[PDB]
């Protein structure tokens, strides 16, 4: 279906413990494929997906220098925002940035992203037209006037319209067997009696990719969404994800409850029972 | 690939 490539950034200042901590990661859909950490012994853009390891040395030399400059620029911004908000140099503060682009099934650009945050709240964001900004407070408006004068949005628009979609298509083809080959979930139902008159039916969904999944319970064909305990989708540790849904059922009426699993890796939705 | 942009706040 639709695909996306996003880069996350986090700079956390540590006044007295040296230079601020800087960690940036890159994702294609739900797959981490590059990472950079300033606390590493050798700060370099490192691969995290076997399909990205086929890029030459000029690729990793470029992304390393771009991440190092991003780290140093955020260090200047951490000191800059201290004067914008009149904050002491003793406290720790966070700077976050995220940019990327979404593409449709035809590979064409669907939406480009670029937005920053400070201490967990929105700061300044590139609007959907790629030609304007949205500032959150008066401090971000100072940044907005600087970026408009320096014409920063013109470079962002060029990247989101060109380099972001072109290199995203390259990753989707070079990792076609993992980025475009969905992994269906392994499904099974467990039984857990609480009392002598009620039990718990937990519908398990394990080892699926991408993370987008829909777990629904049906009692004689009616959705039990009000009484369904649903947990957040969680990473298994091997690029796959997990999720389960449990409903408290009275003892003796287990076969009257059915689980329904929706996933793009399934050509047909799967209905399971306690067995 | 990553965005090449130096835009101080």
């Amino acid at each position, epitope marked *: 279906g639709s695909h996306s490539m996003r880069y996350f950034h986090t700079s956390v200042s540590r006044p007295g413990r040296g230079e601020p901590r800087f960690i940036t990661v890159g994702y294609v859909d739900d797959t981490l494929f590059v990472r950079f950490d300033s606390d590493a012994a050798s700060p370099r853009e490192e691969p995290r997906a076997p399909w990205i390891e086929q890029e030459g040395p*000029e690729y990793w*030399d*470029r992304e390393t*220098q*771009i991440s*190092k*400059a991003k780290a*140093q*620029t955020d260090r*200047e911004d951490l000191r800059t925002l201290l004067r914008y908000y009149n904050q002491s140099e003793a406290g720790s503060h966070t700077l976050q940035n995220m940019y990327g682009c979404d593409v449709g099934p035809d590979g064409r650009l669907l939406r480009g992203y670029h937005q920053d945050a400070y201490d967990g709240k929105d700061y300044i964001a590139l609007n959907e037209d790629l030609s304007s900004w949205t500032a959150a407070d008066t401090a971000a408006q100072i940044t907005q006037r*600087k*970026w408009e*004068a*320096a*014409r*920063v949005a*013109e*470079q962002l628009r*060029a*990247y989101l319209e*060109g*380099e972001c979609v072109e290199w995203l298509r390259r990753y989707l083809e070079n990792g076609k067997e993992t980025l475009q080959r969905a992994d269906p979930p392994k499904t099974h139902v467990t039984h857990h009696p609480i009392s002598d008159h009620e039990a718990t039916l937990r519908c398990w969904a394990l080892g699926f990719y991408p993370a987008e999944i829909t777990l629904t319970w049906q009692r004689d064909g009616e959705d039990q969404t009000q009484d369904t305990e649903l947990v957040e989708t969680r990473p298994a540790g091997d690029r796959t994800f997990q999720k389960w849904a449990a409903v408290v059922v009275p003892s003796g009426e287990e076969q009257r409850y059915t689980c329904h699993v929706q996933h793009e890796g399934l050509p047909k939705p799967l209905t399971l029972r306690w067995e | 690939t990553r*965005l*090449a*942009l*130096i*835009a*101080p706040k």
Partner: T-cell receptor
Amino acid sequence: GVTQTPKHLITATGQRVTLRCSPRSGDLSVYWYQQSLDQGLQFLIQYYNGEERAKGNILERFSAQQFPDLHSELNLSSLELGDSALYFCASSVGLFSTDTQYFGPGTRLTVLE
Amino acid sequence: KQEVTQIPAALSVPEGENLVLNCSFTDSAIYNLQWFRQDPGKGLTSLLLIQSSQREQTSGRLNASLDKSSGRSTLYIAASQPGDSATYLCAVLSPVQETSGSRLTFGEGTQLTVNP
């Protein structure tokens, strides 16, 4: 725009000279360049708000600094014949990679024995 | 490692014809590419600034292209006038491995003489 002082400078070897520059009103970063016959335009050093930002293959006998009034001075000490070149000073609003630098008229230095 | 080369070194053409100035750089990791003109006695004047992800820029009779994958740049001058006679310099903003910040890397330049 950018102003550089002096305009020309003719001195002997082993001497020491000072080149002054004044960036544009509102410019916070200053740049120094060297244009000779055997190397073309070459980057030397860059300052931003009185602090060193970037540095090229600059010799230890070349000293530069930026003052709180944002003007810069470049000390060329122990001059040699090869130091004869055209030294430019440029400035920018800040460190934005999407903007441009503005160059001054330059200072022409000729070192004789 | 970042090196910029401009060809040719000199170009004398009659008045009115179109012109093609070439520029190449080694390290494709750039932040922007600029074209300057240098008049003797004066400094450098910025003609065109191409962003990193852009492919072309236009201002008046000037058009410049950028291809980072090939590391080339071309400046097109349509209907050359005698007033265009200057040394056209090709500059690149790019970092260097294991240094503080990024800087400009200039080429040797193309001495253009538009004879009237």
